Design a protein around this ligand. Structure first.
Ligand SMILES: Nc1ncnc2c1ncn2[C@@H]1O[C@H](CSCC[C@H](N)C(=O)O)[C@@H](O)[C@H]1O
Ligand SMILES: [Zn+2]
Lengths: 176, 179, 300
């Protein structure tokens, strides 16, 4: 699955096989070229190599967020901190959820019937904070903003490692 | 005199320069010497060619005491090189704090702020008939906001360029729009 | 904590400009803007003399360490120098473009700091009277300055919330006491060791700042100080009392150990702008403005 060529942050370390996302300094959020629209689409973000002191923000975001936006700047992008699970969305300070562990197969899901959303930080099908609810109708980009240069994978294979349990997602072999 | 408790007390200014006085080819930037020589000359000589004094145009300014030549380098606008969305955060912040916002950019990716980190190029007023402009140069992979001159800028003349909002420029070519 | 009223130093014709003790602890003299620096005693209020010979009113008179030499911050924009001993027109020293509000001395008794309303702290000479330097102090007039234990620093009481600890010898801003608020800073002074700062900002709250660290430790509650530049003091002769003037016709004296209302003295009929402490014994200067014109000898 080919990643983004123009609608991303080209200074970030998107790999040459186009299956591995590595960030840099400054919260420029690389967004993949496959924004979900409707039905049920779930991809994984297989975290493999990540040093400590990385607030690896993972979640969902709309195209009206900036390429240089932090994941959790405005009313369109969610937020997920490693330290104490503190979420910042619509610029609201909520020491709300839990963080994550290193090596966990991440990858989140937002529920788009063709409205009713399921915005929970899906780490291996385990709750890491029931985040938000009641999105609008539109395109929702993949959303990865990083503080350091950590080496995490992103999965588009239909035989997923740890999806949400009893998720009737469409397999990602129809996205590209 | 101890009885008339008077007003005009607080200034809301982080800098306090308003004293009683406030007394307002050889060089490589005018030579055909290469751009690293000009850029190495610029940081060493913008500290000693110009100076910050109190501005009748607006606030405090950049009053040179030297016949600045035409087309040469004057000063480098160096400050907080923040991301383009940290611009709106610091704009809301220094709207909440009252400190004047200084955000001139190189491009549409990251904008140089000049509020916490800065230099004497914060004290550059705007004249709609100015004596300088700017060009984006390239040094060692980095880009630098460099204020190139236009004409022979005399002793005592305050330094202004084109920023590209009613101004105190005093010129007859006035746009009154800086967006 | 039993300061008792003893005498009344009556005779003033205008608002009493200052009531400060002499450095020998034996002459609580006083002055006003009526060109009458009324030299009084300390224990009974016995009359000694009265200095006159100005053109306009008088803002500040400051004590030299021999209890004799008096510089006058007179409102004719002069620095007329006078004497407890003689009272001769020693040096009339003009120069300031606005009213010379306050004046102080170094402990070496050889410099004349001049806190005027002209936004330029100039320094003058005791022997002849040359304008020594001119500090680019503030965009605000000066209400109060002080030297440290030797005279090497100048603290500022600006009006936009700035207490710049100025150098004296080289004369540059060494440390700027920063505040996100910009209160009208009224009367600052160094600690008697020179290592702590009592910044009297006008928010009904005195602020004791450290000089080394720089953060506040203790404050005070339940006192009226918002409009006038009310002087504060330090007293260790009894307890650790802090003598200050009042606006609701009191004598504001409380303790740094208490920080609250534990002792009040009373009897004035105007705003007490100047207070002072006797250095060894328990004599406290208390005198208000034009609607009082009396000096009240409190004594424990
Ligand atoms: N020529 C001019 N006339 C009116 N406003 C100007 C101006 N040049 C710059 N400005 C605006 O005024 C602000 C300068 S701050 C004023 C100068 C300095 N801070 C001081 O007073 O000491 C800037 O934010 C700028 O946008
Ligand atoms: Zn203008």
């Amino acid at each position: 699955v080919l990643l983004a060529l123009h609608d991303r942050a080209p200074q970030l370390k998107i790999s040459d096989d186009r299956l591995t996302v590595v960030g840099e300094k400054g919260y420029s959020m690389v967004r993949a070229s496959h924004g979900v629209r409707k039905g049920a689409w779930y991809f994984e973000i297989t975290v493999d190599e990540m040093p400590p002191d990385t607030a690896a923000r993972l979640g969902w975001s709309q195209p009206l967020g900036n390429l240089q936006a932090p994941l959790g700047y405005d009313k369109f992008s969610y937020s997920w901190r490693s330290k104490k699970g503190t979420k910042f969305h619509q610029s609201i300070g909520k020491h709300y959820s839990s963080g994550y562990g290193q090596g966990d197969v991440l990858g989140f899901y937002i529920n788009l019937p063709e409205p009713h959303s399921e915005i929970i930080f899906y780490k291996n099908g385990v709750n890491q904070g029931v985040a938000y609810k009641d999105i609008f109708e539109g395109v929702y980009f993949p959303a990865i903003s990083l503080y350091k240069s950590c080496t995490v994978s992103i999965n588009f294979g239909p035989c997923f490692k740890y999806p949400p349990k009893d998720l009737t997602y469409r397999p990602m072999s129809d996205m590209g | 005199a101890r009885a008339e408790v008077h007003l005009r007390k607080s200034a809301f200014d982080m800098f306090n320069f308003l004293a009683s006085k406030h007394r307002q080819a050889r060089r490589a930037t005018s030579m055909d010497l290469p751009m690293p020589m000009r850029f190495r000359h610029l940081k060493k000589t913008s500290k000693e060619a110009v100076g910050v004094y109190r501005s009748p145009i607006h606030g405090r300014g950049l009053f040179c005491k030297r016949n600045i030549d035409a087309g040469e380098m004057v000063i480098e606008y160096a400050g907080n090189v923040i991301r383009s969305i940290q611009t709106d955060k610091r704009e809301k912040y220094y709207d909440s704090k009252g400190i004047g916002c200084y955000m001139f950019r190189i491009d549409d990716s990251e904008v140089v702020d000049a509020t916490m980190h800065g230099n004497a190029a914060r004290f550059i007023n705007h004249s709609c008939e100015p004596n300088c402009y700017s060009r984006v140069i390239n040094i060692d992979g980095q880009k630098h906001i460099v204020i190139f001159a236009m004409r022979k800028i005399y002793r005592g003349e305050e330094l202004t360029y084109d920023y590209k909002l009613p101004c105190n420029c005093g010129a007859k070519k006035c746009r009154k729009f800086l967006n | 904590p039993n300061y008792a009223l003893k005498f009344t130093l009556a005779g003033h014709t205008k608002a009493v400009s200052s009531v400060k003790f002499s450095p020998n602890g034996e002459w609580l003299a006083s002055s006003s803007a009526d060109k009458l620096i009324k030299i009084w005693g300390a224990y009974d209020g016995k009359f000694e003399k009265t200095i006159s010979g100005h053109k306009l009113g008088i803002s500040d008179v400051a004590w030299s360490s021999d209890s004799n030499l008096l510089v006058s911050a007179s409102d004719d924009k002069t620095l007329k120098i006078w004497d407890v001993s003689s009272g001769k027109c020693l040096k009339t020293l003009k120069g300031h473009s606005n009213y010379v509000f306050c004046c102080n001395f170094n402990p070496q008794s050889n410099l004349i700091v001049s806190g005027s309303f002209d936004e330029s702290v100039r320094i003058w000479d005791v022997k002849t009277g040359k304008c020594l330097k001119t500090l680019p102090a503030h965009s605000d007039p000066v209400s109060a300055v002080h030297f440290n234990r030797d005279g090497s620093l100048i603290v500022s009481s600006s009006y936009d919330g700035l207490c710049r600890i100025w150098d004296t010898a080289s004369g540059q801003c060494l440390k700027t006491l920063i505040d996100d608020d910009n209160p009208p800073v009224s009367f600052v002074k160094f600690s008697p060791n020179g290592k702590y700062i009592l910044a009297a900002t006008l928010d009904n709250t005195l602020k004791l700042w450290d000089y080394s660290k720089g953060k506040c430790l203790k404050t005070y509650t339940g006192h009226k100080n918002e409009k006038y530049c009310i002087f504060a003091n330090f007293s260790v002769t009894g307890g650790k009392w802090i003598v200050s003037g009042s606006e609701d016709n009191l004598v504001y004296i409380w303790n740094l150990q208490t920080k609250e209302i534990v002792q009040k003295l009373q009897g004035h009929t105007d705003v007490v702008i100047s207070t002072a402490c006797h250095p060894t014994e328990n004599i406290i200067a208390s005198a208000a403005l034009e609607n009082d014109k009396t000096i009240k000898l409190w004594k424990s």
